């Protein structure tokens, strides 16, 4: 079907930044598109209907264009009930679809995250199951990617992570990893690697253990 | 003023079959043109678009979904029904119904199309869990290691949320980071919390985890191995 | 298809 996709995917501002986000539409839906902003553990509010009409109640700073494939919201001057995330909707077609979203954060100094691999605890271990957790601490901006890799393999399906919400004084974000294996496979192998890339970091850094050195 | 508001079960077994209601106020399912549709939200992703249905009850599915979900109203109750049949996991997240204005007309003459183009008044959502899970209590390991230090404690295969985790029975706040917890494919959330303290601190560290549902307090004093 | 008060 018909693909609305928003860009940018994620956005830094501050208070007072003007900000413009843009969706594009695989095929022309007129005028039918509509803005909406939804902050952490709310449902999306309606900013702008059928492109570019203001919805009633919501403030002058936003402000919504285009029509056919191409549509901008901006927000004039961005207020702190803005860092939120935004998404645009089509109705023109059926399904009525929804683009993917784009996040919109405080900005602040890239920083690169501290690492950590802490290897399963013997208490789990007996109950025979191996989570290796790995901890990405305090980095900005929020986008990062871990690998594992056991003796040299490239790990996959077999880890989850999430990561908290912006830190409110720091603006920096935490990501941990859970590398999850039977006893028995962890057994079967030595080197539990922890591979981490982001823009604060020069190149990839890497933080492992041998399983059972003494 | 429009008000809606989404009511069903909060966890669902896999295979079964979910009801979803939405009663709302402020319109009629019989005003000309109006719409009330369903939308979802799986926890930290997108939203996604599932349904509507018009007063003059036209009904519209996601094609992805139609052939396990059902929309009806029931314009007497105020009340709109969404029913899912056969759920699974990836099913679980947060459900949505919202209100879809109809063309403003003139002495009854429709003479503006642009107010359908929105969904203008959302419901808070309800979450829905999907799991076939029972009721258990986290088992709690410990997670031990600019010049800082690390360690934490990881809160494993419980169900359902939410579990709470403390340090030093709440005086250890700075450094603290609780990580919300991932649904396992097993069907059982799990989550680690850890904290960092200037790698001269190694003070003690205890993790003060609390699973309400299955009445699990844990209390784990973490350090740095090597006896 | 199209919706339903379409363009």
Same mark, same amino acid.
Do not use: C, M, N, R
């Given at each position: 079907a018909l693909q609305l996709t928003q860009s940018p995917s994620s956005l830094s501002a501050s208070v007072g930044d003007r900000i413009t986000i843009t969706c594009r539409a695989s095929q022309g839906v007129t005028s039918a598109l509509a803005w909406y902003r939804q902050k952490p553990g709310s449902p999306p509010q309606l900013?702008? !209907?059928?492109? @570019?009409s203001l919805e009633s109640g919501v403030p002058s700073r936003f402000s919504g264009s285009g029509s056919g494939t191409e549509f901008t919201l901006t927000i004039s001057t961005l207020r702190p009930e803005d860092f939120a995330t935004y998404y645009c909707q089509q109705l023109?077609? !059926?399904?009525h679809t929804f683009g993917g979203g784009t996040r919109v954060d405080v900005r602040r100094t890239v920083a690169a995250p501290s690492v950590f691999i802490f290897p399963p605890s013997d208490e789990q271990l007996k109950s025979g199951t191996a989570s290796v957790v790995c901890l990405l601490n305090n980095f900005y901006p929020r986008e990062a990617k871990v690998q594992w890799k056991v003796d040299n393999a490239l790990q996959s399906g077999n880890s989850q992570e999430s990561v908290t919400e912006?830190? @409110?004084?720091?603006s920096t974000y935490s990501l941990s990893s859970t590398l999850t294996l039977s006893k028995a496979d962890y057994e079967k192998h030595k080197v539990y690697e922890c591979e981490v890339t982001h823009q604060g970091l020069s190149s990839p850094v890497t933080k492992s253990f041998n399983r059972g050195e003494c | 003023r429009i008000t809606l508001k989404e009511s069903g079960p909060p966890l669902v077994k896999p295979t079964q079959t979910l009801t979803l209601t939405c009663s709302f106020s402020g319109? $009629?399912?019989?005003?000309?043109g109006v719409g009330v549709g369903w939308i979802r939200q799986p926890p930290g992703k997108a939203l996604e678009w599932l349904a509507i249905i018009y007063s003059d009850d036209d009904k519209r599915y996601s094609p992805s979904l139609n052939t396990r979900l059902t929309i009806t109203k029931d314009t007497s109750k105020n009340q709109v029904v969404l029913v899912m049949t056969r759920? $699974?996991?990836?099913?679980?997240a947060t459900y949505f119904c919202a209100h879809r204005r109809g063309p403003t007309t003139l002495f009854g003459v429709p003479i503006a199309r642009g107010p359908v183009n929105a969904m203008d008044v959302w419901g808070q959502g309800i979450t829905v869990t999907i799991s076939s899970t029972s009721t258990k209590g986290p088992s709690v390991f410990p997670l031990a290691p600019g010049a800082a230090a690390a360690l934490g404690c990881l809160v494993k295969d419980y169900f359902p949320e939410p579990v709470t985790v403390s340090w030093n029975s709440g005086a250890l706040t700075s450094g603290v980071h609780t990580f919300p917890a991932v649904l396992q494919s097993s069907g059982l959330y799990s989550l680690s919390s850890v904290v960092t303290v200037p790698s001269s601190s190694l003070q003690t560290y205890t993790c003060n985890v609390n699973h309400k549902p299955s009445n699990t307090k844990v209390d784990k004093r973490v350090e740095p191995k090597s006896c | 298809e199209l919706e339903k008060w379409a363009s």
């Open positions: 900013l702008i !209907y059928d492109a @570019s023109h077609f !059926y399904p912006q830190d @409110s004084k720091d | 319109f $009629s399912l019989s005003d000309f759920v $699974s996991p990836v099913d679980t | -």
